[PDB]
């Protein structure tokens, strides 16, 4: 089972969309169709500028504000019981940008409770809102021991206009030292 994905292949290292959401994340190469209007990446993080590498993104043209898209990792087996990390890169460029949330879902926990307002703070690894500029940022999140198998859930929320494309790339789970390193140089909480 792969613990990292650069999204270069169409099978996405076993990541799959949520069976009940508003729309799918898309895999794409370079520029988003709405790019000319100051939104979305111009290239992925793996191969960078001039590069032709692939990222995942929400197409926000023709969707409604606060509609959500979810991308789910394969199911992992207590690889969090170490010093577990989730590390990923994201691109949030666009006026009227929506939001990006990253949850850790224990397998037993149904997606309904996971997302509910009542209980989602216990599971949020990452939450960001608004325009962040034309640039790839990164995040590293400590992962809690839930004594269960689990999934990583990346949820994009469309903003108030079609200029709210969000992209992810280069996702990763790591353990131990690699975590303390990551925390030394990745933005974290
Ligand atoms: C959309 O969600 C954000 C935060 O959850 C909230 O501030 C905003 O008012 C919501 N707008 C609508 C129209 O649902
Ligand atoms: C940290 O990363 C290196 C290179 O990928 C690898 O050799 C090492 O096994 C990793 N450490 C742990 C504790 O997984
Ligand atoms: Ca990539």
UniProtKB/TrEMBL annotation:
Residues the entry annotates as binding Ca(2+): 6, 8, 44, 46, 54, 169
Annotated MAM domain residues: 3-181
Disulfide bonds: 5-13, 85-179
Glycan-bearing residues: 66, 178
Record protein name field: Scavenger receptor SR-C-like protein
Species lineage: Eukaryota, Metazoa, Ecdysozoa, Arthropoda, Hexapoda
First and last residues shown, out of full length: 139 to 320 of 614
